[PDB]
Amino acid sequence: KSEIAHRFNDLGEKHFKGLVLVAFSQYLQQCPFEDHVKLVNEVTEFAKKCAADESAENCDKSLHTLFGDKLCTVATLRATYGELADCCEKQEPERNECFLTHKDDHPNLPKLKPEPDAQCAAFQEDPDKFLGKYLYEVARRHPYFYGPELLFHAEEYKADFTECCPADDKLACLIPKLDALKERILLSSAKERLKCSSFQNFGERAVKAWSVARLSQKFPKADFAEVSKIVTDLTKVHKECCHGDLLECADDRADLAKYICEHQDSISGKLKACCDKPLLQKSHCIAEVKEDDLPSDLPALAADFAEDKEICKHYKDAKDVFLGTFLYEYSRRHPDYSVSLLLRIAKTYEATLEKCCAEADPPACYRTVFDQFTPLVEEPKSLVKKNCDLFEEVGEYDFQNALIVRYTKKAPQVSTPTLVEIGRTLGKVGSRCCKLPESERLPCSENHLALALNRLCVLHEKTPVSEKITKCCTDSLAERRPCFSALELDEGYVPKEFKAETFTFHADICTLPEDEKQIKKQSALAELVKHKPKATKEQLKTVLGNFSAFVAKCCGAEDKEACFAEEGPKLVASSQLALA
Ligand SMILES: CC(C)Cc1ccc([C@H](C)C(=O)O)cc1
Ligand SMILES: CC(C)Cc1ccc([C@H](C)C(=O)O)cc1
């Protein structure tokens, strides 16, 4: 009778208020905090009134109608929000669709550095306002962030300040925890953005396929019936969250966490720990649960999927069912494979049956289908071994430098900051994944690589520069990494004009901390390649080494600007000759 009442009743006031604040911060990214807080408190008051009397006026209206009418009491300021003003002239569901279309992925808001003493004071004074500010600041920076997971991370944010504010040194207690939390926010955002990107670009079938593969790996003891059930429910949850239906999303996610935990005997023996936790922690634990042990009764796939003489009939009868079954069975027994590799294998299997069932003698044609998977498996295995061998030899910094050179040579039209960011990001993937057991390296590496490539594709949608990038981004999720791997330096690329100022360092760099110094030098590295794209890796390594030594010498000098002023121009001049 009243949707807002039902969601308020199911979620409770605190979670309701949290999710409405996040939704508003994601939809309305540029507006300040107190404006959002008022609209949350006003909407929650309305929810309470409706919960008391569901047959009252305006309580029967849709969440989009109510919340949209609420957003449009401040979104009409065209100066602060351009298009959102236009969206507010539309009725539903056109208005909601208009809001979704104009969500900014790279809003480019000031990066927030913690003020430990100022923050600890504000936490103790008004904890609700402080934690509200966190949800708000993260939400508008990450407009497709998984709503209920942001509440979970907000409780971790609370747990940090709670533990450290009462201590004698607040600053050095917090920094490691908030730096750690920031990493988790980045990974989590990337994970959810791929799901929304998959809905947006490829549709439901792609999302379900992806989930079937991942959950089959996670829950090998579970039968095909159980994974299909969980995938169907999980796809509806993520479909709701990606389409801005956060109260609906959160409620259905809680229902799924409940079901998994009530039926964990027929899902996984790894869920016992997860299922003794409060709502947000329980859902999070399940989402991140490690893969179960392989069952002893895994079947022979070759007999069922290559040798059976009437496979073409079974395929025609129900294609997605038969393919889903193959993906389920193949995924279960290959926990050491990446999800994109499993989907590529499934796609190859489908392609073989599509070709072979249109031929004279089908069984002879698809007899060797499993041998087509061998080259698909060896490709990523070789890449991870090559990258991990290099990482373990040269370490994170020089590994990042190798990737910045590799990637600038492939796509020199891409912006220096973006090229540096992808090189640095994938550099850290190496450090995290190459230390793991050999069997966990390939999933870790290629699953994280998929998140990095999707981030790049989402940035490229906003700011297109390269026709090659568009090609790799708009083709299938399975073929994405192969397409990016296959990218090579344009035969008719015009080297970026030399600009001495680009490679000129000043004493300002001595201010910056280590990571920021690295980014300045790694930016110069990208620029070196854009001007000299045929320059060898060792040439570029030597020139960067000379720039590093120069920066170290002049930052350690009694008169820093005199050193930079004298030595800088010499190195800029000689560097051109070294990269011919
Ligand atoms: C702590 C977090 C998990 C839930 C939560 C819910 C609502 C609010 C609002 C903004 C408020 O209390 O003012 C903050 C935090
Ligand atoms: C912009 C572009 C160069 C990004 C890009 C392209 C290819 C790869 C593959 C997986 C590799 O590491 O060789 C990663 C990132």
Ligand located closest to 43 CA: 1
CA distances from 344 to 97, 137, 197, 330, 338 (A): 32, 38, 18, 12, 10
Ligand located closest to 529 CA: 2
Distance, CA of 185 to CA of 196 (rounded, Å): 16
DSSP letter at 302 equals H
- Alpha-carbon dihedral sign for residues 321, 305, 329, 451: negative
Does the domain spanning 491-568 belong to CATH 3.90.1310.10?
no
| 576 C-beta closer than 6 A to ligand 2 | no
Domain segments of the chain as ranges:
1-104, 105-193, 201-292, 293-378, 379-490, 491-568
47 contacts 19 by C-beta, under 8 angstroms: no
Does the domain spanning 379-490 belong to CATH 3.30.420.40?
no
Under CATH, what is the fold of the domain 201-292?
Serum Albumin; Chain A, Domain 1 (1.10.246)
Q: Whose CA is nearest to atom 9 of ligand 2?
A: 485
Residues preceding gaps in the chain (C to N > 2.5 Å):
none
User: Experimental method used, please?
Assistant: X-ray
**In a 3-state reduction of DSSP, which class is residue 279?**
helix
Rounded (10°) angle between helices 116-125 and 147-164: 100
Binding site residue list: 3, 10, 64, 240, 243, 245, 248, 251, 255
525 contacts 540 by C-beta, under 8 angstroms: yes
292 contacts 268 by C-beta, under 8 angstroms: yes
Considering only CA atoms, give the Rg of the chain.
Answer: 27
| 199 C-beta closer than 6 A to ligand 2 | no
**In a 3-state reduction of DSSP, which class is residue 44?**
helix
Mutate to test the pocket of ligand 1, among 21, 33, 149 (most ligand atoms within 8 A of CB): 21
Q: Quote the tokens at residue 461.
A: 């949608």
Under CATH, what is the fold of the domain 293-378?
Serum Albumin; Chain A, Domain 1 (1.10.246)
Report residue 547: phi and psi, to 5°: -70, -40
Distance, CA of 549 to CA of 529 (rounded, Å): 20
Distance, CA of 530 to CA of 408 (rounded, Å): 7
Count of C-beta atoms within a 10 Å radius of residue 363? 15
Fold match flag (201-292 vs 293-378): yes
Distance, CA of 493 to CA of 399 (rounded, Å): 25
Query: Of all residues in the chain, what percent are helix, strand and coil, respectively (each to 5)?
Result: 75, 0, 25
CATH annotation of 105-193 = 1.10.246.10
Q: Whose CA is nearest to atom 13 of ligand 2?
A: 485
Cis, peptide link before residue 127, omega less than 30° from 0: no
Resolution of the experimentally solved model in angstroms: 2.2
Instruction: Specify the amino acid at residue 566.
Output: E
Lining ligand 1 with CB less than 6 A are 14, 17-18, 21, 40, 128, 131-132, 135, 151, 154-155
| 449 C-beta closer than 6 A to ligand 2 | yes
By CB neighbour count within 10 A (0-12 exposed, 13-18 middle, 19+ buried), where does 12 fall? exposed
| 410 C-beta closer than 6 A to ligand 2 | yes
Distance, CA of 248 to CA of 67 (rounded, Å): 13
CATH architecture of the domain with range 1-104: Orthogonal Bundle (1.10)
Binding site residue list for Zn(2+): 64, 243, 245
E-only strand ranges, 344-389: none
DSSP letter at 252 equals H
How many Å separate Cα 499 from the centre of its chain? 35
| 470 C-beta closer than 6 A to ligand 2 | no
Q: Whose CA is nearest to atom 3 of ligand 1?
A: 151
| 413 C-beta closer than 6 A to ligand 2 | no
Count of C-beta atoms within a 10 Å radius of residue 564? 23
Distance, CA of 133 to CA of 104 (rounded, Å): 19
Contacting residues for 273 by C-beta, under 8 A, at least 6 apart: 285
Instruction: Specify the amino acid at residue 319.
Output: K
Ligand located closest to 16 CA: 1
Q: Dmax of the chain from CA atoms?
A: 84
150 contacts 135 by C-beta, under 8 angstroms: yes
- Alpha-carbon dihedral sign for residues 403, 409, 414, 417: positive
Mutate to test the pocket of ligand 2, among 425, 453, 475 (most ligand atoms within 8 A of CB): 453
Ligand located closest to 157 CA: 1
The secondary element (H helix, E strand) that includes residue 410 is helix 373-410
Distance, CA of 371 to CA of 366 (rounded, Å): 10
The secondary element (H helix, E strand) that includes residue 526 is helix 514-531
- Torsion of the alpha carbons at 179, 183, 185 and 186, rounded to the nearest 10: 130
Q: Quote the tokens at residue 177.
A: 């925890």
CA 14 – ligand 1 centroid, Å: 6
Q: Whose CA is nearest to atom 12 of ligand 1?
A: 128
Binding site residue list for Ca(2+): 3, 10, 240, 245, 248, 251, 255
Q: Whose CA is nearest to atom 10 of ligand 2?
A: 485
Report residue 248: phi and psi, to 5°: -65, -50
CA angle 385, 426, 171 (to 5 degrees): 125
Distance, CA of 163 to CA of 175 (rounded, Å): 13
CA 407 – ligand 2 centroid, Å: 6
Question: With helix as H, strand as E and coil as C, how does 84-124 read?
Answer: HHHHCCCCCCHHHHHHHHCCCCCCCCCCCCCCHHHHHHHHH
CA 295 – ligand 2 centroid, Å: 36
